Design a protein around this ligand. Structure first.
Ligand SMILES: CCCCCCCCCCCCCC(=O)O
Ligand SMILES: CCCCCCCCCCCCCC(=O)O
Ligand SMILES: CCCCCCCCCCCCCC(=O)O
Ligand SMILES: CCCCCCCCCCCCCC(=O)O
Ligand SMILES: CCCCCCCCCCCCCC(=O)O
Ligand SMILES: CCCCCCCCCCCCCC(=O)O
Length: 567
């Protein structure tokens, strides 16, 4: 506990133990946690100053101080029972009572002027409360990674609270953090879903694919070492024992840094960075440049005499070899595309080795699979370029509403709004880095949607895509065609009742309400052309800009016009 305090430092240690205590005890107030944090820091500094304290000589002390919460009986009944248990069982029992989506209040982001005042008047009390608040709202979310957002949030506040128009400064930077943080919370949930739902082999494959792309100058042996190491750390990070998940992540971070030459040049920045930030930086590292003049996969994976021999001798390792060579050659491909190829390659080699001449039987078949997302990025990033972030969200909104109108309107807005944000972040990345970027943000937004589909299931079609494999989630969602079986929702004047709100509203709130209406319009009349949607959208555009008095009358013109025009 002394050794841990020194490497993280007091500010990160106090923040981590606050995050960690917020993650375990989600239902004691902030002041109860601060009390525990200051008592733990005082106690860690006892160990740092002396180490002679018999209490000092990490899992146990964390568990001990958990049990020092009095309101454990009242507030968190089932959670407090672990204090009866001894420490092998006790810490395992504690991790069991963390709540994945704890359905606490939506955190209200106050006005930028308000936040900046509280950040001036008492910044740590400000940040540390909101950290605690985010941390108890996300208990599985890896405590140091969340601390990197707190630092990024403190960075956003320190830079934007002094700025000209702090709305124009901070609100984009808080949206950047909320979105990256929502992406980073949802990435953690997905990678832990991956391990359970699709299996260790599927995760390892992804790991192989991810690590081979990120570290192409690394050996397959080296990648395979990291892939398993990575799989252990995630296994520990999904369980929710954050101390052992952190140890294993740091163990791997210190391992990657000791073997950089055999792994990647790009890790130099990360390996210089401290223990706390090492893991995250290695995870965030740029793909190294692929080695000068590597041979295409057709020699060692089609034309070699030893293809079916080496495949049958170790099916995971050879397909992992295949994945490795392909992913190192193609960091431009999504990790799930490389797994699609690997799965296809497996499917061919199961067929081809049994087939009389495997050489003739067994790379052409990858060209449709590669082109499909690469055309999807191209189409969508053409549609993003020509329409811009908002109108692209609307393109998708009508697309995904028509496709799966059974899904609730706020979800359809938010998925499509976040899918616009996927489009926004990844179309700005070059053609090479486009599909990987998407994969990441897209798979987050799709797993977000499938988690929203858990405990509000609405469509057969979306649930098929969610219950489809890791590799097949997005193709299935792309494969979604307009629901011809959707009986259109009854004309709902409530949704198409436009109050005066829209003009004064900030573009975000204005956009969502327009988008809300646009979903409900497409739910009312799904058989309604792009031209007919442009007709209603530019009826609305002329109507809102021309417009308290007008909304009731001129609005009801547009509505009757639209009901007629669409069928
Ligand atoms: C992560 C920890 C952040 C501590 C400071 C955050 C203050 C709140 C800013 C608004 C939060 C949000 O973007 O929803
Ligand atoms: C009390 C605070 C205990 C902190 C446990 C987690 C340590 C995180 C180490 C950083 C890392 O490797 O990501
Ligand atoms: C360094 C310890 C764990 C960090 C992961 C490093 C692997 C680099 C590839 C990035 C894969 C996603 C991040 C992750 O697996 O945690
Ligand atoms: C979810 C479908 C993925 C299918 C990918 C087929 C290739 C599997 C390779 C598994 C990698 C083994 C890991 C290792 O080499 O250590
Ligand atoms: C609920 C709405 C379902 C959204 C489907 C998202 C499709 C994501 C992949 C991008 C694409 O195929 O256009
Ligand atoms: C009965 C149909 C009424 C619903 C109309 C919803 C249209 C919303 C999308 C158009 C947004 C206007 C363009 C703009 O000002 O940004």
């Amino acid at each position: 506990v002394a050794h841990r305090f020194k490497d993280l430092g007091e500010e990160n240690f106090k923040a981590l133990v606050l995050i960690a205590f917020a993650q375990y005890l989600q239902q004691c107030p902030f002041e109860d946690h601060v009390k525990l944090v200051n008592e733990v820091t005082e106690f860690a500094k006892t160990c740092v100053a002396d180490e002679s304290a018999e209490n000092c000589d990490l899992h146990t002390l964390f568990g001990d101080k958990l049990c020092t919460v009095a309101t454990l009986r009242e507030t968190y009944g089932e959670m407090a029972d672990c204090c009866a248990k001894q420490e092998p069982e006790r810490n395992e029992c504690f991790l069991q009572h963390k709540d994945d989506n704890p359905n606490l209040p939506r955190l209200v982001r106050p006005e930028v002027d308000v936040m900046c005042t509280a950040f001036h008047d008492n910044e740590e009390t400000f940040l540390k409360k909101y950290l605690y608040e985010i941390a108890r709202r996300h208990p599985y979310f890896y405590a140091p990674e969340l601390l990197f957002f707190a630092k990024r949030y403190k960075a956003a506040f320190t830079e934007c609270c002094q700025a000209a128009d702090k709305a124009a400064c901070l609100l984009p930077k808080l949206d950047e953090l909320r979105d990256e943080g929502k992406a980073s919370s949802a990435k953690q949930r997905l990678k832990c879903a991956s391990l359970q739902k699709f299996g260790e082999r599927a995760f390892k494959a992804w790991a192989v694919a991810r690590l081979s792309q990120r570290f192409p100058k690394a050996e397959f042996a080296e990648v395979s070492k990291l892939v398993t190491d990575l799989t252990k750390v995630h296994t520990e990070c999904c369980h929710g024992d954050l101390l052992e998940c952190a140890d294993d992540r740091a163990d791997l971070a210190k391992y990657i840094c000791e073997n950089q030459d055999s792994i990647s040049s790009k890790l130099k920045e990360c390996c210089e960075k401290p223990l706390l930030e090492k893991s995250h930086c290695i995870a965030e590292v740029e793909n190294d440049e692929m080695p000068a003049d590597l041979p295409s996969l057709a020699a060692d994976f089609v034309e070699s005499k030893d293809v079916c021999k080496n495949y049958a001798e170790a099916k995971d390792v050879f397909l992992g070899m295949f994945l490795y060579e392909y992913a190192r050659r193609h960091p431009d491909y999504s990790v799930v595309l490389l797994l699609r190829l690997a799965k296809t390659y497996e499917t061919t080699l199961e067929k081809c080795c049994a087939a009389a001449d495997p050489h003739e039987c067994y790379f052409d078949e990858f060209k449709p699979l590669v082109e499909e997302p690469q055309n999807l990025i191209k189409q969508n990033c053409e549609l993003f370029e020509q329409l811009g972030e908002y109108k692209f969200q609307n393109a998708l909104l009508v697309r995904y509403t028509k496709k799966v109108p059974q899904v609730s309107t706020p979800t359809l807005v938010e998925v499509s709004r976040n899918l616009g944000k996927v489009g926004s972040k990844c179309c700005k990345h070059p053609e090479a880095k486009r599909m990987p970027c998407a994969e990441d943000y897209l798979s987050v937004v799709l797993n977000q949607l499938c988690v929203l589909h858990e405990k509000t299931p609405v469509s057969d079609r979306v649930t098929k895509c969610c219950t489809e494999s890791l590799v097949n989630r997005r193709p299935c969602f792309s494969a979604l065609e307009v629901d011809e079986t959707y009986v259109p929702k009854e004309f709902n004047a409530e949704t198409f009742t436009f109050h005066a709100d829209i003009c004064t509203l900030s573009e975000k709130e204005r956009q969502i309400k327009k988008q809300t209406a646009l979903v409900e319009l497409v739910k009312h009349k799904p058989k309604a052309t792009k031209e007919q949607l442009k007709a209603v959208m530019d009826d609305f555009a002329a109507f809102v800009e021309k417009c308290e008095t007008c909304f009731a009358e001129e609005g009801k013109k547009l509505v009757a016009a639209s009901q007629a025009a669409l069928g």
